Amino acid sequence: APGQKECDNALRQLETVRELLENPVQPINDMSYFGCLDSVMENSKVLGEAMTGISQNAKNGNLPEFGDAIATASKALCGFTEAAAQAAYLVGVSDPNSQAGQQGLVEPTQFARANQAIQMACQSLGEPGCTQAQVLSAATIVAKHTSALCNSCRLASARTANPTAKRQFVQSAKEVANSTANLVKTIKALDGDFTEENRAQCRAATAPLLEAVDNLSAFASNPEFSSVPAQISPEGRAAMEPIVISAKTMLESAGGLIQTARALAVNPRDPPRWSVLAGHSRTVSDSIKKLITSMRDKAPG
Protein backbone atom coordinates (compact mmCIF):
# COMPACT_ATOMS: atom_id res chain seq x y z
CA ALA A 1 0.00 0.00 0.00
CA PRO A 2 1.28 3.50 -0.92
CA GLY A 3 2.37 5.33 2.24
CA GLN A 4 3.29 2.20 4.22
CA LYS A 5 6.90 1.97 3.03
CA GLU A 6 7.24 5.73 3.55
CA CYS A 7 6.05 5.52 7.18
CA ASP A 8 8.40 2.60 7.93
CA ASN A 9 11.30 4.41 6.22
CA ALA A 10 10.49 7.64 8.08
CA LEU A 11 10.46 5.87 11.45
CA ARG A 12 13.85 4.30 10.65
CA GLN A 13 15.38 7.65 9.60
CA LEU A 14 14.03 9.29 12.77
CA GLU A 15 15.62 6.56 14.90
CA THR A 16 18.94 7.16 13.11
CA VAL A 17 18.86 10.98 13.21
CA ARG A 18 18.01 11.12 16.94
CA GLU A 19 21.52 9.77 17.65
CA LEU A 20 22.86 13.25 16.76
CA LEU A 21 21.27 14.54 19.97
CA GLU A 22 22.90 12.04 22.37
CA ASN A 23 26.19 13.90 22.94
CA PRO A 24 26.34 16.89 20.54
CA VAL A 25 29.76 18.08 21.73
CA GLN A 26 31.57 17.99 18.37
CA PRO A 27 30.69 19.70 15.06
CA ILE A 28 28.64 17.56 12.64
CA ASN A 29 28.50 19.96 9.68
CA ASP A 30 29.89 23.33 8.52
CA MET A 31 26.86 25.52 9.35
CA SER A 32 27.32 28.76 11.28
CA TYR A 33 24.95 29.47 14.18
CA PHE A 34 22.73 31.67 12.01
CA GLY A 35 23.00 29.00 9.30
CA CYS A 36 21.46 26.59 11.81
CA LEU A 37 18.70 29.08 12.66
CA ASP A 38 17.95 29.55 8.94
CA SER A 39 17.71 25.76 8.53
CA VAL A 40 15.45 25.38 11.57
CA MET A 41 13.14 28.08 10.18
CA GLU A 42 13.01 26.58 6.67
CA ASN A 43 12.51 22.98 7.88
CA SER A 44 9.83 24.04 10.39
CA LYS A 45 7.89 25.66 7.53
CA VAL A 46 8.19 22.57 5.30
CA LEU A 47 7.25 20.28 8.22
CA GLY A 48 4.18 22.41 8.98
CA GLU A 49 2.97 21.98 5.40
CA ALA A 50 3.83 18.27 5.47
CA MET A 51 1.83 17.61 8.67
CA THR A 52 -1.25 19.09 6.97
CA GLY A 53 -0.56 16.87 3.94
CA ILE A 54 -0.32 13.80 6.17
CA SER A 55 -3.63 14.37 7.92
CA GLN A 56 -5.64 15.57 4.92
CA ASN A 57 -4.48 12.83 2.55
CA ALA A 58 -4.97 10.08 5.14
CA LYS A 59 -8.47 11.47 5.85
CA ASN A 60 -9.49 11.41 2.19
CA GLY A 61 -7.65 8.25 1.11
CA ASN A 62 -5.24 9.93 -1.30
CA LEU A 63 -2.51 7.38 -0.63
CA PRO A 64 0.24 8.43 -3.05
CA GLU A 65 -0.11 12.04 -1.82
CA PHE A 66 -0.03 10.73 1.77
CA GLY A 67 3.25 8.91 1.10
CA ASP A 68 4.75 12.06 -0.43
CA ALA A 69 3.78 14.07 2.69
CA ILE A 70 5.31 11.43 5.00
CA ALA A 71 8.54 11.53 2.97
CA THR A 72 8.62 15.36 3.02
CA ALA A 73 8.05 15.36 6.79
CA SER A 74 10.88 12.85 7.28
CA LYS A 75 13.34 14.96 5.29
CA ALA A 76 12.34 18.09 7.24
CA LEU A 77 12.67 16.29 10.59
CA CYS A 78 16.18 15.15 9.64
CA GLY A 79 17.23 18.60 8.41
CA PHE A 80 15.81 20.10 11.57
CA THR A 81 17.71 17.67 13.83
CA GLU A 82 21.03 18.23 12.04
CA ALA A 83 20.61 21.99 12.52
CA ALA A 84 19.62 21.58 16.19
CA ALA A 85 22.58 19.28 16.96
CA GLN A 86 25.03 21.66 15.29
CA ALA A 87 23.48 24.63 17.11
CA ALA A 88 23.73 22.79 20.42
CA TYR A 89 27.43 22.13 19.79
CA LEU A 90 28.04 25.80 18.88
CA VAL A 91 26.31 26.95 22.06
CA GLY A 92 28.36 24.48 24.14
CA VAL A 93 31.72 25.44 22.62
CA SER A 94 30.97 29.17 23.01
CA ASP A 95 31.16 28.98 26.83
CA PRO A 96 34.27 30.85 28.14
CA ASN A 97 35.55 27.64 29.79
CA SER A 98 35.02 25.48 26.72
CA GLN A 99 38.02 24.84 24.47
CA ALA A 100 37.41 25.11 20.74
CA GLY A 101 39.13 22.44 18.68
CA GLN A 102 40.24 22.80 15.09
CA GLN A 103 38.98 21.31 11.83
CA GLY A 104 41.26 18.72 10.25
CA LEU A 105 42.30 19.26 6.63
CA VAL A 106 40.74 15.99 5.41
CA GLU A 107 37.73 14.19 6.91
CA PRO A 108 39.31 10.91 8.10
CA THR A 109 36.48 8.36 7.75
CA GLN A 110 35.61 8.95 4.07
CA PHE A 111 39.33 9.32 3.27
CA ALA A 112 40.00 5.83 4.66
CA ARG A 113 36.94 4.45 2.85
CA ALA A 114 38.05 5.98 -0.45
CA ASN A 115 41.53 4.46 -0.15
CA GLN A 116 40.11 1.05 0.81
CA ALA A 117 37.61 1.14 -2.08
CA ILE A 118 40.34 1.95 -4.60
CA GLN A 119 42.54 -0.84 -3.21
CA MET A 120 39.74 -3.43 -3.46
CA ALA A 121 38.66 -2.31 -6.95
CA CYS A 122 42.31 -2.65 -8.02
CA GLN A 123 42.32 -6.16 -6.53
CA SER A 124 39.16 -6.95 -8.55
CA LEU A 125 40.86 -5.87 -11.79
CA GLY A 126 43.46 -8.43 -10.68
CA GLU A 127 41.21 -11.45 -10.06
CA PRO A 128 41.81 -14.29 -12.56
CA GLY A 129 38.06 -15.01 -12.78
CA CYS A 130 36.99 -11.34 -13.11
CA THR A 131 34.26 -11.06 -15.79
CA GLN A 132 34.52 -8.31 -18.44
CA ALA A 133 31.54 -6.56 -16.81
CA GLN A 134 33.48 -6.55 -13.53
CA VAL A 135 36.31 -4.55 -15.19
CA LEU A 136 33.78 -1.79 -15.93
CA SER A 137 32.14 -1.91 -12.48
CA ALA A 138 35.58 -1.79 -10.82
CA ALA A 139 36.38 1.16 -13.06
CA THR A 140 33.33 3.06 -11.75
CA ILE A 141 34.54 2.57 -8.17
CA VAL A 142 38.02 3.84 -9.13
CA ALA A 143 36.47 6.82 -10.94
CA LYS A 144 34.34 7.77 -7.96
CA HIS A 145 36.98 7.55 -5.27
CA THR A 146 39.99 8.93 -7.11
CA SER A 147 37.97 12.00 -8.09
CA ALA A 148 36.80 12.31 -4.46
CA LEU A 149 40.40 12.08 -3.20
CA CYS A 150 41.47 14.85 -5.58
CA ASN A 151 38.57 17.03 -4.45
CA SER A 152 39.59 16.47 -0.79
CA CYS A 153 43.18 17.39 -1.68
CA ARG A 154 42.12 20.70 -3.22
CA LEU A 155 39.94 21.46 -0.18
CA ALA A 156 42.84 20.64 2.17
CA SER A 157 45.17 22.84 0.10
CA ALA A 158 42.70 25.75 0.38
CA ARG A 159 42.31 25.19 4.14
CA THR A 160 46.01 25.31 5.06
CA ALA A 161 48.11 28.48 5.25
CA ASN A 162 51.31 26.39 5.19
CA PRO A 163 52.69 27.03 1.68
CA THR A 164 54.56 23.70 1.59
CA ALA A 165 51.41 21.74 2.56
CA LYS A 166 49.37 23.75 0.03
CA ARG A 167 51.67 22.65 -2.79
CA GLN A 168 52.03 19.05 -1.60
CA PHE A 169 48.28 18.38 -1.41
CA VAL A 170 48.02 19.48 -5.06
CA GLN A 171 51.05 17.37 -6.08
CA SER A 172 49.69 14.27 -4.32
CA ALA A 173 46.36 14.74 -6.08
CA LYS A 174 48.16 15.02 -9.43
CA GLU A 175 49.89 11.71 -8.72
CA VAL A 176 46.55 10.01 -7.98
CA ALA A 177 44.95 11.53 -11.09
CA ASN A 178 47.82 10.77 -13.45
CA SER A 179 48.29 7.20 -12.24
CA THR A 180 44.53 6.71 -12.66
CA ALA A 181 44.67 8.15 -16.19
CA ASN A 182 47.36 5.59 -17.09
CA LEU A 183 45.19 2.81 -15.62
CA VAL A 184 42.23 4.07 -17.70
CA LYS A 185 44.27 3.53 -20.90
CA THR A 186 44.71 -0.15 -19.95
CA ILE A 187 41.06 -0.53 -18.93
CA LYS A 188 40.07 0.73 -22.40
CA ALA A 189 42.48 -1.76 -24.01
CA LEU A 190 41.19 -4.67 -21.88
CA ASP A 191 37.53 -3.81 -22.58
CA GLY A 192 38.26 -3.58 -26.33
CA ASP A 193 40.21 -6.85 -26.46
CA PHE A 194 39.69 -9.14 -23.47
CA THR A 195 43.03 -10.98 -23.64
CA GLU A 196 45.20 -12.49 -20.88
CA GLU A 197 48.01 -10.13 -21.92
CA ASN A 198 45.75 -7.06 -21.57
CA ARG A 199 44.58 -8.37 -18.18
CA ALA A 200 48.23 -8.47 -17.11
CA GLN A 201 48.82 -4.95 -18.48
CA CYS A 202 45.81 -3.66 -16.53
CA ARG A 203 46.96 -5.44 -13.33
CA ALA A 204 50.39 -3.82 -13.76
CA ALA A 205 48.95 -0.32 -14.17
CA THR A 206 47.15 -0.62 -10.79
CA ALA A 207 50.53 -0.53 -8.99
CA PRO A 208 51.31 3.20 -9.57
CA LEU A 209 47.77 4.06 -8.45
CA LEU A 210 48.10 1.97 -5.28
CA GLU A 211 51.44 3.71 -4.64
CA ALA A 212 49.84 7.13 -5.20
CA VAL A 213 47.04 6.25 -2.75
CA ASP A 214 49.54 5.01 -0.17
CA ASN A 215 51.79 8.10 -0.60
CA LEU A 216 48.85 10.46 -0.15
CA SER A 217 47.62 8.50 2.88
CA ALA A 218 51.09 8.79 4.43
CA PHE A 219 51.30 12.53 3.73
CA ALA A 220 47.72 13.34 4.83
CA SER A 221 48.13 11.46 8.12
CA ASN A 222 50.56 14.07 9.49
CA PRO A 223 49.37 14.90 13.04
CA GLU A 224 49.67 18.59 12.09
CA PHE A 225 46.76 18.12 9.65
CA SER A 226 44.54 16.21 12.09
CA SER A 227 41.35 17.45 13.73
CA VAL A 228 41.52 18.49 17.38
CA PRO A 229 38.35 17.68 19.37
CA ALA A 230 36.38 20.39 21.12
CA GLN A 231 36.27 20.34 24.91
CA ILE A 232 32.87 21.35 26.27
CA SER A 233 32.62 22.67 29.82
CA PRO A 234 29.81 21.63 32.23
CA GLU A 235 28.45 25.20 31.88
CA GLY A 236 28.48 24.76 28.08
CA ARG A 237 26.59 21.48 28.47
CA ALA A 238 23.98 23.18 30.67
CA ALA A 239 23.61 26.01 28.15
CA MET A 240 22.89 23.67 25.21
CA GLU A 241 20.42 21.48 27.12
CA PRO A 242 17.21 23.43 26.28
CA ILE A 243 17.98 23.09 22.55
CA VAL A 244 18.67 19.36 22.94
CA ILE A 245 15.56 18.66 25.07
CA SER A 246 13.27 20.48 22.62
CA ALA A 247 14.76 18.63 19.62
CA LYS A 248 14.33 15.27 21.42
CA THR A 249 10.73 16.09 22.35
CA MET A 250 10.01 17.09 18.76
CA LEU A 251 11.26 13.72 17.47
CA GLU A 252 9.28 11.78 20.08
CA SER A 253 6.05 13.47 18.97
CA ALA A 254 6.96 13.12 15.28
CA GLY A 255 7.41 9.36 15.76
CA GLY A 256 4.00 9.21 17.43
CA LEU A 257 2.54 11.29 14.61
CA ILE A 258 3.88 8.96 11.91
CA GLN A 259 2.74 5.83 13.80
CA THR A 260 -0.77 7.27 14.21
CA ALA A 261 -0.90 8.41 10.57
CA ARG A 262 0.21 4.96 9.38
CA ALA A 263 -2.85 3.48 11.10
CA LEU A 264 -5.24 6.20 9.87
CA ALA A 265 -4.11 5.71 6.25
CA VAL A 266 -5.27 2.10 6.55
CA ASN A 267 -8.45 2.99 8.46
CA PRO A 268 -9.44 6.68 8.69
CA ARG A 269 -12.70 5.94 10.54
CA ASP A 270 -11.17 6.43 13.98
CA PRO A 271 -12.10 9.60 15.90
CA PRO A 272 -9.74 8.84 18.84
CA ARG A 273 -6.70 8.50 16.54
CA TRP A 274 -7.59 11.79 14.82
CA SER A 275 -7.38 13.45 18.20
CA VAL A 276 -4.07 11.68 18.93
CA LEU A 277 -2.76 12.84 15.54
CA ALA A 278 -3.75 16.46 16.26
CA GLY A 279 -2.09 16.20 19.69
CA HIS A 280 1.20 14.92 18.27
CA SER A 281 1.14 17.51 15.53
CA ARG A 282 0.59 20.39 17.96
CA THR A 283 3.29 19.01 20.27
CA VAL A 284 5.72 18.92 17.33
CA SER A 285 4.88 22.59 16.69
CA ASP A 286 5.22 23.49 20.40
CA SER A 287 8.62 21.78 20.61
CA ILE A 288 9.85 23.66 17.54
CA LYS A 289 8.63 26.94 19.06
CA LYS A 290 10.54 26.16 22.28
CA LEU A 291 13.69 25.26 20.34
CA ILE A 292 13.58 28.49 18.32
CA THR A 293 13.10 30.52 21.51
CA SER A 294 16.06 28.72 23.11
CA MET A 295 18.26 29.31 20.05
CA ARG A 296 17.49 33.03 20.15
CA ASP A 297 18.30 33.13 23.88
CA LYS A 298 21.48 30.99 23.79
CA ALA A 299 22.98 32.58 20.64
CA PRO A 300 26.79 32.95 20.76
CA GLY A 301 26.99 35.08 17.60
Partner: peptide
Protein backbone atom coordinates in the same frame (compact mmCIF):
# COMPACT_ATOMS: atom_id res chain seq x y z
CA UNK B 1 36.28 4.80 -25.76
CA UNK B 2 33.75 7.59 -25.16
CA UNK B 3 31.74 5.53 -22.66
CA UNK B 4 34.80 4.93 -20.46
CA UNK B 5 35.76 8.62 -20.83
CA UNK B 6 32.27 9.53 -19.55
CA UNK B 7 32.79 7.24 -16.55
CA UNK B 8 35.82 9.34 -15.57
CA UNK B 9 34.32 12.79 -16.26
CA UNK B 10 34.50 13.84 -12.60
CA UNK B 11 38.19 12.96 -12.45
CA UNK B 12 38.78 14.87 -15.70
CA UNK B 13 37.21 17.94 -14.05
CA UNK B 14 39.55 17.50 -11.09
CA UNK B 15 42.51 17.23 -13.49
CA UNK B 16 41.38 20.44 -15.22
CA UNK B 17 41.55 22.26 -11.88
CA UNK B 18 44.83 20.66 -10.76
CA UNK B 19 46.48 21.65 -14.06
CA UNK B 20 45.95 25.34 -13.19
CA UNK B 21 48.44 25.25 -10.30
Amino acid sequence: NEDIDQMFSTLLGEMDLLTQS
